[PDB]
Curated annotation (Swiss-Prot), chains B, C, D:
Family: Belongs to the rotavirus VP6 family.
Known partners and oligomeric status: Homotrimer. Interacts with the inner capsid protein VP2. Interacts with the outer capsid glycoprotein VP7. Interacts with the outer capsid protein VP5*.
Subcellular location: Virion
An annotated Gene Ontology molecular function: metal ion binding
Further facts: The VP6 trimer contains a zinc ion located at the center of the molecule. The zinc ion is not essential for either trimerization or transcription activity of the DLP. Zinc-depleted VP6 has an increased sensitivity to proteases.
Residues of the full protein shown: 1 to 133 of 397
Domain of life: Viruses
Keyword Ubl conjugation part of the UniProt annotation: yes
Region (Interaction with the inner capsid protein VP2): 62-73
Protein name (database record): Intermediate capsid protein VP6
Length: 799, 133, 133, 133
């Protein structure tokens, strides 16, 4: 019970989904980055006809075209405006197209006299409106009637006329100029296959498909780990290795034509003569020796080596057959693939139960934490060449590190790959079969020696098994795209030495190699996971950098990191330690932003002020000047208390006033009638009443600031006095200058200019984008009987 | 002096790097700095003095930003950039000449021309970038 | 001239910046410019002439692009870049030598060698970048 | 030598480009290189000068990284960067002086000072960047 409690305490800090196997589905549901196509041009502005007024305030008989936000939904408060622009950045990133084909958006130009087309239907509406307008220039009208698209099918190019606001043109032009589609051909697909599988003679790869010059594809972002999650992220790395282990288990092949379990069990029982001994565990000795255990051992070993997930050894010391099999396990599997305690325990059991007793040596008094493993001490303390040489190999058979195609790989000693070292193992244990075991009881000695011979006499089968395991490991490792970082994980995969015995005693001579489709599926899953990892890193970094550069100080990067981890699809975020979350936040902060997202952010940042000042429901500030200032004459309002700039006034930032809560300065200035300029995104009341101006109601909207110590309810008055006012006669029929003591800091809409809005958008006429490159590869395999290893000899030679 | 040097270096980099056909990645940071300079200088009135025979000159800044969305720079981009670059270069040269012809005894290291004194304000500190000469 | 200078400047920057162990962020723009130069020059045949004792040399460009998927440049990247850089430097030196030994009364400002006249076509203007000398 | 030059070049760029008010885009790559240098040098002990009257200087590197979150550099960023740059510049000057005063008949081209010998290791090769002098 206590063990379960402690293990649950440890596991609650690991974001691994509790039904480990289910992780496989979550890994295989990750698809390639969804290919986004643009259906209409991106627009933030539209041309709109607005009434205009003469200098005397009388509405004119014609409307004028101005640029207005299509969706005017900007909030009040500077911080809220910056949050709105961050949301706009997220929207643009999510809806950013990966490629564009303008012909899809091309529509008939009604006024064209030469069968002209334009992109998009909004451009057609704008062009018709300008064409029908009476105030349009004759030259502009004739150009609309004559402007033409140019479709060059031989060159695969299309140019269309478009009407776009300069910001809209900037966005659409960036989309057109920076598409993610690359030309696709058979050379690209052939090089997409892992290089070591293309060189493997056991796999026949053919290109029985013809790719047109119009074929396209999007390159996966296989950038290596920028977060270095293998370093100082114990829980996240545990989860990553667990997911990789599950996937590798899914792709490891199944053994065929194993030795009959009944025959091998009877052989082992007859040789060991357990019933004749006095062992308290007579039945348990041969339990777990079956074909299922052998397959489980094969899968566990190869998957653990592929995922670089630490393994623990579970064995019963009294079962010396398990130790004899563990000798082979330590011969073939690198010693650093096991948790130090398990390796030490297994090696010490082997030393103190078999090897040292064999040579009449005093049992080793091994001290935990010794820099030397028990086998390292035994190598120096044992004089026999066979056993000492085998011990030397087992001591020095750690993984070697090599970078292939930019991917770090953990590779085996060449003696493991060809299976030759098994001979040495055999040699060593053959010596152990001839040893006296000086003081050991003779029946137990006979049983131990006969088990040693049980393993020894399978030399050919064990060489074949070692070669098969190494070949499978290499072939599946060719499909790994992320660096194989070796880290001792928090939790391990428990490997039963009885399963090792099953694999050693039941392996036949049926070569089983990964299917070409299995290799392609494994490589595709790895590529999808790596690409999603990189893309979500890019998204998180872009959003964090945008929030910091937008001065969104109340933004919590914790939510961004949680969303990033959730989109990685393999983390239960509820079990991520907080220190690791904050370390992830810091490391994400240190990364630079990806070029495309950074360019989009630069566009939004440079156009922020123009977009905000185009809003009709927020003003940029309010000047309280207790002198009487004439109402300005503007074509958009008539008379209006509009400030073109804040020059000549002390500026109080309303956001800073809200954040600090110190209203002493503002209160002192309002009480003493000190001219000031309150700066910040403010809602305003449009007042068309001349009587309101005479009553001076615009100067009565600031006492609530002092009363409530709030600035969120500040709604300055913006007078709009023109002939449409019910009391405009007061302006017209009397000799006076309309004045006010307050002005609203706001901008005037930009006029629509046809010359500045007409652009030519250029794209390709058509192409087809492909996702599964490996579907273009016809992959066959040789007969397993004829499968060869790296040394050009058959994987299994016992035949 | 730092702001004046930054203006001059931005203009020199614009002349050297804004060339037809060049990848925008070769000028992205330069275009960002140039747009920052335009934003900081916009809406400001400057006067270069009438000391000696140097004529009084007035300078206004109401320029638009440069594009940032092309894969390669074209002729239109270069001409649009040059129109602004010529004005900015003329302003910088006139400010430099106005500062070069003035001297003071109490504080000779501080700016002498009113244009450079204005440019020494905090609001122009944004223009400052790489000081390598 | 601008294209030839841009080739020389790109090669000098590749020699100086593409070094083992350097961050890819230190060369991203340089790598993009280098790859653009490779794309533009690939598939083109040049001849540096036999004027005087200068030997006739034929230049063919079939080079792979430099990778863009590293965090720090390694030995493989540097060697792969250096082979191409050596070939391009030899080509540029030969083109410069061919141009230097030529003159004309009519259009002596215009290119004289066949290689530089070919490089004056629009299909090479993409190579053009920072002109700071 | 290349690592020492890269240290000096990074420090010169930091002194010239990390200035108050400058756009972060003007330093972003430089900030990445600077942080790489800080990470590489952190946790390393150096000793310079035991020949002639050159004093024995001991150097420890425990510095925090520069931020990447600002739009324009401010006073705090510049002060932190300046402190780190001052320490690194003093270290580089002392290492250069230590190397300049030594000589060898056999391998005079090879590093002579222990600091440069340590810097010639692989663990410092990451510091290497643009070699343009």
């Amino acid at each position: 019970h206590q063990k379960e409690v402690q293990y649950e305490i440890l596991q609650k800090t690991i974001p691994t989904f509790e039904p480990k196997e289910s992780i496989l589905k979550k890994l295989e549901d990750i698809k390639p980055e969804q290919v986004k196509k643009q259906t209409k041009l991106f627009r933030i502005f539209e041309p709109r006809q607005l009434p205009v007024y003469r200098a005397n305030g009388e509405k004119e008989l014609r409307n004028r075209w101005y640029w207005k936000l299509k969706r005017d939904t900007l909030p009040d408060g500077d911080y809220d405006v910056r949050e709105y622009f961050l949301n706009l950045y997220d929207q643009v990133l999510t809806e950013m197209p990966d490629y564009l084909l303008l012909k899809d958006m091309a529509v008939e130009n009604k006024n064209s006299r030469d069968a002209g087309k334009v992109v998009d239907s909004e451009t057609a509406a704008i062009c018709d409106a300008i064409f029908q307008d009476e105030e349009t220039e004759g030259v502009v009208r004739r150009f609309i009637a004559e402007m033409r698209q140019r479709v060059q099918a031989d060159r695969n190019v299309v140019n269309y006329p478009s009407i776009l606001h300069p910001i809209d043109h900037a966005f659409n032009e960036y989309f057109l100029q920076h598409q993610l589609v690359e030309p696709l051909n058979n050379d690209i697909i052939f090089n997409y296959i892992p290089e070591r599988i293309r060189n493997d003679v056991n796999y026949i790869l053919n290109m029985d498909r013809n790719l047109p010059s119009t074929a396209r594809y999007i390159r996966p972002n296989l950038l290596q780990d920028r977060l270095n999650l293998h370093d100082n992220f114990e829980s996240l790395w545990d989860t990553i290795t667990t997911s990789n282990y599950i996937l590798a288990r899914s792709v490891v092949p199944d053994l065929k034509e194993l030795v009959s379990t009944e025959a091998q069990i009877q052989k082992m029982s007859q040789d060991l003569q357990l019933e004749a001994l006095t062992i308290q565990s007579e039945t348990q000795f041969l339990t777990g020796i079956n074909s299922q255990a052998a397959n489980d051992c094969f899968k566990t070993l190869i998957a653990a080596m592929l995922s670089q997930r630490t393994m623990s050894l579970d064995f019963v010391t009294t079962n010396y057959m398990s130790l004899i099999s563990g000798m082979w396990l330590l011969t073939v599997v690198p010693n650093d693939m096991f948790i130090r305690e398990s390796l030490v325990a297994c090696q010490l059991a082997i030393i103190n139960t078999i090897i040292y007793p064999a040579f009449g040596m005093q049992r080793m008094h091994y001290r935990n934490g010794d820099p030397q493993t028990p086998f390292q001490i035994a190598e120096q303390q044992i004089q026999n060449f066979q056993v000492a040489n085998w011990l030397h190999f087992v001591n020095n058979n750690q993984f070697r590190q090599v970078v292939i195609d930019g991917v770090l790989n953990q590779v085996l000693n060449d003696n493991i790959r060809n299976g030759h070292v098994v001979n040495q193992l055999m040699e060593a244990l053959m010596q152990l079969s001839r040893q006296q075991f000086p003081t050991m009881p003779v029946d137990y000695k006979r049983s131990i020696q006969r088990g040693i011979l049980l393993l020894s006499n399978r030399l050919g089968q064990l060489v074949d098994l070692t070669r098969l395991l190494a070949y499978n490991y290499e072939t599946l490792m060719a499909c790994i795209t992320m660096n194989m970082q070796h880290v001792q994980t928090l939790t391990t995969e428990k490997l039963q030495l009885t399963s090792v015995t099953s694999l050693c005693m039941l392996i036949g001579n049926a070569t089983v190699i990964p299917s070409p489709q299995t290799l392609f599926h494994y490589y595709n899953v790895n590529v999808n996971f790596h690409s999603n990892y990189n893309e979500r890193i890019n998204d998180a970094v872009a959003i964090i950098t945008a929030a910091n550069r937008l001065n969104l100080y109340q933004k919590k990067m914790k939510s961004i990191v949680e969303d990033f981890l959730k989109r990685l699809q393999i983390f239960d975020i509820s079990r991520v330690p907080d220190d690791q979350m904050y370390r992830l936040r810091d490391r994400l902060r240190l990364l630079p932003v990806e070029i495309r997202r950074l360019d989009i952010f630069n566009l939004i940042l440079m156009n922020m002020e123009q977009i905000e000042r185009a809003s009709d429901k927020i003003a940029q500030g309010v000047i309280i000047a207790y002198r009487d200032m004439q109402l300005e004459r503007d074509e958009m309002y008539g008379y209006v208390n509009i400030a073109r700039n804040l020059d000549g006034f002390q500026q109080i930032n309303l956001e800073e006033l809200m954040r600090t809560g110190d209203y002493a300065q503002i209160t002192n200035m309002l009480l003493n009638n000190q001219p000031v300029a309150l700066v910040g995104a403010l809602p305003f009341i449009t007042d068309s009443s001349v009587i309101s101006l005479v009553a001076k109601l615009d100067a009565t909207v600031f006492a609530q600031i002092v009363k409530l110590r709030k600035v969120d309810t500040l709604k300055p008055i913006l007078y709009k006095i023109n002939s449409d006012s019910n009391d405009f006669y007061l302006v017209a029929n009397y000799d006076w200058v309309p004045t006010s003591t307050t002005k609203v800091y706001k901008q005037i809409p930009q006029q629509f200019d046809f010359r500045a809005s007409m652009h030519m958008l250029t794209s390709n006429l058509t192409f087809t984008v492909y996702s599964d490159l490996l579907a273009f590869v016809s992959a066959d395999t040789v007969e397993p009987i004829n499968a060869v290893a790296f040394d050009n000899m058959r994987i299994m030679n016992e035949l | 002096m730092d702001v004046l040097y930054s203006l001059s270096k931005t203009l020199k980099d614009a002349r050297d790097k804004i060339v037809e056909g060049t990848l925008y990645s070769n000028v992205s940071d330069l275009i960002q700095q140039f747009n920052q300079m335009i934003i900081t200088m916009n809406g400001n009135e400057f006067q270069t003095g009438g000391i000696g025979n140097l004529p009084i000159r007035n300078w206004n800044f109401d320029f638009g930003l440069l594009g940032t969305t092309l894969l390669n720079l074209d002729a239109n981009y270069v001409e649009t950039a040059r129109n602004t670059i010529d004005y900015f270069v003329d302003f910088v040269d006139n400010v430099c000449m106005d500062e070069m012809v003035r001297e003071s005894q109490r504080n000779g290291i501080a700016p002498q021309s009113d244009s450079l004194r204005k440019l020494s304000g905090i609001k122009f500190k944004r223009i400052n970038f790489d000081n390598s000469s």
